[PDB]
Design a protein around this ligand. Sequence first.
Ligand SMILES: [Mg+2]
Ligand SMILES: [Mg+2]
Ligand SMILES: [Mg+2]
Ligand SMILES: [Mg+2]
Ligand SMILES: [Mg+2]
Ligand SMILES: [Mg+2]
Ligand SMILES: [Mg+2]
Ligand SMILES: [Mg+2]
Ligand SMILES: [Mg+2]
Ligand SMILES: [Mg+2]
Ligand SMILES: [Mg+2]
Ligand SMILES: [Mg+2]
Ligand SMILES: [Mg+2]
Ligand SMILES: [Mg+2]
Ligand SMILES: [Mg+2]
Ligand SMILES: [Mg+2]
Ligand SMILES: [Mg+2]
Ligand SMILES: [Mg+2]
Ligand SMILES: [Mg+2]
Ligand SMILES: [Mg+2]
Ligand SMILES: [Mg+2]
Ligand SMILES: [Mg+2]
Ligand SMILES: [Mg+2]
Ligand SMILES: [Mg+2]
Ligand SMILES: [Mg+2]
Ligand SMILES: [Mg+2]
Ligand SMILES: [Mg+2]
Ligand SMILES: [Mg+2]
Ligand SMILES: [Mg+2]
Ligand SMILES: [Mg+2]
Ligand SMILES: [Mg+2]
Ligand SMILES: [Mg+2]
Ligand SMILES: [Mg+2]
Ligand SMILES: [Mg+2]
Ligand SMILES: [Mg+2]
Ligand SMILES: [Mg+2]
Ligand SMILES: [Mg+2]
Ligand SMILES: [Mg+2]
Ligand SMILES: [Mg+2]
Ligand SMILES: [Mg+2]
Ligand SMILES: [Mg+2]
Ligand SMILES: [Mg+2]
Ligand SMILES: [Mg+2]
Ligand SMILES: [Zn+2]
Lengths: 213, 109, 112, 169, 51, 117
Amino acid sequence: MARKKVRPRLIAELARRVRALREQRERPRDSQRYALDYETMMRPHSGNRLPMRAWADVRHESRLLQLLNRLPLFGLGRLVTRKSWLWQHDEPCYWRLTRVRPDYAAENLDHGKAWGILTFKGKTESEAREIEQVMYHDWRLVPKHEEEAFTAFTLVPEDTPLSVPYPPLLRAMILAQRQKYGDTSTEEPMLNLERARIDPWDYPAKLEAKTKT
Amino acid sequence: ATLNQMHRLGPPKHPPGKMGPTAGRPQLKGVVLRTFIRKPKKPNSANRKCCRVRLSTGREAVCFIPGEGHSLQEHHVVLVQGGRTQDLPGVKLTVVRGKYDCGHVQKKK
Amino acid sequence: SIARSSVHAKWVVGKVIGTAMQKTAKVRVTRLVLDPYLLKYFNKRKTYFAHDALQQCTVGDIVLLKALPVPRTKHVKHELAEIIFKVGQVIDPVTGKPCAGTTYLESPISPE
Amino acid sequence: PMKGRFPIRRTLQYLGQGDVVFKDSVKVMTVNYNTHGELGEGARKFVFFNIPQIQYKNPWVQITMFKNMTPSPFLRFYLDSGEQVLVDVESKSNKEIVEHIRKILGKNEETLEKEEQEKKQLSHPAHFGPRKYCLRECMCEVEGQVPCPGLVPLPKEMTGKYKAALKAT
Amino acid sequence: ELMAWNQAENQRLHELRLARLRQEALEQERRQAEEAVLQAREAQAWAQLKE
Amino acid sequence: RAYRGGHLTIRLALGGCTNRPFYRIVAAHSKCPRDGRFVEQLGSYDPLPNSHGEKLVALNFDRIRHWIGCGAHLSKPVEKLLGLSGFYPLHPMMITNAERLRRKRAREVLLASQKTD
RNA sequence: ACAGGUUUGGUCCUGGCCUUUCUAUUAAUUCUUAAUAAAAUUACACAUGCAAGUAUCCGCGCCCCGGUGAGAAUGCCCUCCAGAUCUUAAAGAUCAAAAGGAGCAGGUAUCAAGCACACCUAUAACGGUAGCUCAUAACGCCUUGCUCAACCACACCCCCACGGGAAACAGCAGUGAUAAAAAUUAAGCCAUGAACGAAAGUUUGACUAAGUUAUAUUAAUUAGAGUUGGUAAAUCUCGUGCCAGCCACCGCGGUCAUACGAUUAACCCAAAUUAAUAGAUCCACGGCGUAAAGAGUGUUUAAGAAAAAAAAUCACAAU
RNA sequence: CCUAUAUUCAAUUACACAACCAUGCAAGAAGAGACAAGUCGUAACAAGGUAAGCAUACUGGAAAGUGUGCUUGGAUUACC
Ligand SMILES: [Mg+2]
Ligand SMILES: [Mg+2]
Ligand SMILES: [Mg+2]
Ligand SMILES: [Mg+2]
Ligand SMILES: [Mg+2]
Ligand SMILES: [Mg+2]
Ligand SMILES: [Mg+2]
Ligand SMILES: [Mg+2]
Ligand SMILES: [Mg+2]
Ligand SMILES: [Mg+2]
Ligand SMILES: [Mg+2]
Ligand SMILES: [Mg+2]
Ligand SMILES: [Mg+2]
Ligand SMILES: [Mg+2]
Ligand SMILES: [Mg+2]
Ligand SMILES: [Mg+2]
Ligand SMILES: [Mg+2]
Ligand SMILES: [Mg+2]
Ligand SMILES: [Mg+2]
Ligand SMILES: [Mg+2]
Ligand SMILES: [Mg+2]
Ligand SMILES: [Mg+2]
Ligand SMILES: [Mg+2]
Ligand SMILES: [Mg+2]
Ligand SMILES: [Mg+2]
Ligand SMILES: [Mg+2]
Ligand SMILES: [Mg+2]
Ligand SMILES: [Mg+2]
Ligand SMILES: [Mg+2]
Ligand SMILES: [Mg+2]
Ligand SMILES: [Mg+2]
Ligand SMILES: [Mg+2]
Ligand SMILES: [Mg+2]
Ligand SMILES: [Mg+2]
Ligand SMILES: [Mg+2]
Ligand SMILES: [Mg+2]
Ligand SMILES: [Mg+2]
Ligand SMILES: [Mg+2]
Ligand SMILES: [Mg+2]
Ligand SMILES: [Mg+2]
Ligand SMILES: [Mg+2]
Ligand SMILES: [Mg+2]
Ligand SMILES: [Mg+2]
Ligand SMILES: [Zn+2]
């Protein structure tokens, strides 16, 4: 806070500026960043090792831009799916590519940021978005003829009861609370789950920064 | 004083304790420079065995050796403590008997 | 409806110390503070700069300050609201009559 | 306290026992009184006796005195709204002034008791902690429970030492 | 309610005061008669001496 | 003290003396020390069974749901406690551990009648 | 303070010093066992090991916990909140930087002046007034963590860290040095907390349970220390002879020493007991002819008192 | 610049600077205190053998002496 003799620290500012600058200038190309040593299963850049459960899927499968580099327009309007989704969810889960912006420092051109519109468990989101976990090796491309076989969706309704009992004590508290104010109605108190809907963990999160309203 | 004057000075504050020979520590360790003898002050007389010690604080000071008889040579390390000897003017320290090179007084044999 | 000042001083009343700066009155404010040892009350004084738009202020006037929503400078957090007692020209707030000290300058019982 | 004319008014008790508590509209109270005249008398005793009491209970309110400006004694109250209360105290007694002020902008005894009731629900009986804020520290000290082993050493079985030396063998 | 009450109170006191001051004005004129008499007497005595 | 991030939480502070544990249920910032500063005390839980063979739990329900309503987070053991009380549904992990416990009792039953033979 | 000892041939007064109480460190002497609590010379330098990971790759975490009191009169209390984070649409909520100020806030005035420390204009500039702080302590100098559910600060050094010295335990253990000052190079994530995970769960020198230590309490298995002139509970016989020595203060020792040294008896504390050092406590709401103190004189300033009744003025040696 | 993005830079220059402090050591110098059963005196205390003292001046081995004003913290024993 304010004490009348307080010294003017200059270098505090200098280091902020200089650090931000050396950050922007040395900001790593994601070509080298997610680069992976397949023998040791170790990132050169971060020195990080990959989790045991991801090993096989790393050896045997391909990252997104590995399947998008050999596409003619670099794969616009194409449908893409993820191995994990195919194993867990029997309903269709795909990404439709809106933009693709590869990273060219790469000799083999395997890396880059993507965008699109997502269908998960058959439900479709109405907006464009940046796709998440591109660098992963789970990615697969669906062929043109099979496109209309995957996009084929059998629409089924949801059977989970809209309401459930309150937990035993809480129910008692509510009962007694309404007896006290002279409400005689013995209609069971019910807990309404309409807004308690949550997406399974597989559902990809938006990388886009939030606009504050 | 008046109430204004007492307001203007604040209440009286107890002055911090002024620090003595051991610099506020309970003991000090020091090496013996010289062993000598000092006469007490006038009303009552003997000749009291003292030494000169150098203390871990680097300050050099006269110090007194309790008990009857002692063996102390230069270069002996002793441990000194704060009691002031009333006869001897100027001598504010006392050797601790029974530590390092000052041994406990030997019972007559 | 947000207009505020973070100051504790929202309204104060004080004497005008000096007018020397353009459009700015120096104002000595005084409060009672309880000396803890003697349990007695003494006057602590503190100065405030106040903004005077028309430069209305003689030295010695008792004056009322309102806290400024946005500080004009680092030292000016108040605007001068009213002049409560003009120096040596004082109109009794009780009877509305001119007075010099304890004397009435125009008697309140002589309307006509 | 010896020195002074009415020493009892420098005591914590005397200061406490005065009752006026302004509403929160009140910021500044200004007293204007005279050093002479019979009429002025009451106002003077007010400044001598109650102003200390008042101030003590309204520590945030600027109180300010002025001597021999106007021919007549008065109070002025400055509120937050900008409103200004003017109270003519003339032949009024010390007591009458305090009562009349308490009437205009005081706080009803209802108000004060509600406030202190909100302050006494602040320290809850069933909590645990430092003596400063709570009635009890451990639960070691509630009657039926298990006692602080710093008092009544535990049965060897509840000791972790014994459990560990059991699992080892 | 209370500000109005206070207002009416101040007005009450104001009228009381005006009464008191009229009274004081009267007593004061009486004093002026006395002083005018004495000052006239001594004015005379002085005039005589000097003459 | 000023922190970078972290959320409001309802956890257990551990008071007590060696071998005699005690807990103060507490609403605290997440990043602050276990036994340290807190926002509000909520309840207490005494793990050791008393003279009457009871574990005493105290819950200020009103304030608890005030904070849950501000989006405070619960600790797994506080969850377990509320659930036990019946103010929350049973925590799935309570149920599961119960089942595991049952199967252990079963296999020790069989192993007992197998060793007895 | 419920006070006591000590100024003198003596009495009274004034005035210091000391005793008696309580705690902590260290040391000496003594020491049986448990439990609990606490663990502390060092912002000097550090060998070795460990203290941050989780996770189907991204990510998210990684002085947060934990450490320390170096710096700074820092600051307490209180306004006002940008931002981050959580939740949810929003609204809320938690932590709250910067900016502030009713009040309170270490010593020193032999530190008494600081030397640009203010304001206006308006457009944000040109320009203009000549101010601002301060004996109600400015500006300096010294000392210093704290007002404690906690807070403030630091993170090898150069207030800072781009750079530069240079190669960092003020994480747990350890170790050199240094000091009067001395805990395990230990076991677990089983509980709480924290991180991450959708999750079972993993990690965590936080922490839990242990190890060490009379540091403190308590319980019993444990007896030793100090003292015996007065203050102040308690002494006898030898030895010494102003020597040797003793004492907190008064004082003791010059051949009949209850005061030294040892013995006999006693007193008092007791697993402790003395000593040393730091605290707690302690000065004046008392005084000023003779004891410390009315400042050689008057006037005004600042600041205060006015609290009820009146007054200014005549032989003589002011200047 | 038919989805869209990429990339660059941000260091100097002008001077002053151990004065000024603190902390040690020092050729040396001066004081105070403690100090003989020492040397020289007798200043004070009794009209202390010239009553003491204050300010100031000058002087003297040393206490101190003298001047000028001032003080009683001296007396003049009181029908003398
Ligand atoms: Mg990682
Ligand atoms: Mg003698
Ligand atoms: Mg001694
Ligand atoms: Mg030994
Ligand atoms: Mg504990
Ligand atoms: Mg005497
Ligand atoms: Mg005597
Ligand atoms: Mg005495
Ligand atoms: Mg020890
Ligand atoms: Mg800390
Ligand atoms: Mg400093
Ligand atoms: Mg906000
Ligand atoms: Mg803030
Ligand atoms: Mg320090
Ligand atoms: Mg630093
Ligand atoms: Mg270090
Ligand atoms: Mg640094
Ligand atoms: Mg360590
Ligand atoms: Mg570290
Ligand atoms: Mg060592
Ligand atoms: Mg220790
Ligand atoms: Mg050892
Ligand atoms: Mg754990
Ligand atoms: Mg766990
Ligand atoms: Mg471990
Ligand atoms: Mg002895
Ligand atoms: Mg004898
Ligand atoms: Mg004795
Ligand atoms: Mg003896
Ligand atoms: Mg002990
Ligand atoms: Mg005197
Ligand atoms: Mg005089
Ligand atoms: Mg003088
Ligand atoms: Mg003479
Ligand atoms: Mg004679
Ligand atoms: Mg003589
Ligand atoms: Mg002679
Ligand atoms: Mg003579
Ligand atoms: Mg004489
Ligand atoms: Mg002289
Ligand atoms: Mg001569
Ligand atoms: Mg001559
Ligand atoms: Mg006579
Ligand atoms: Zn306990």
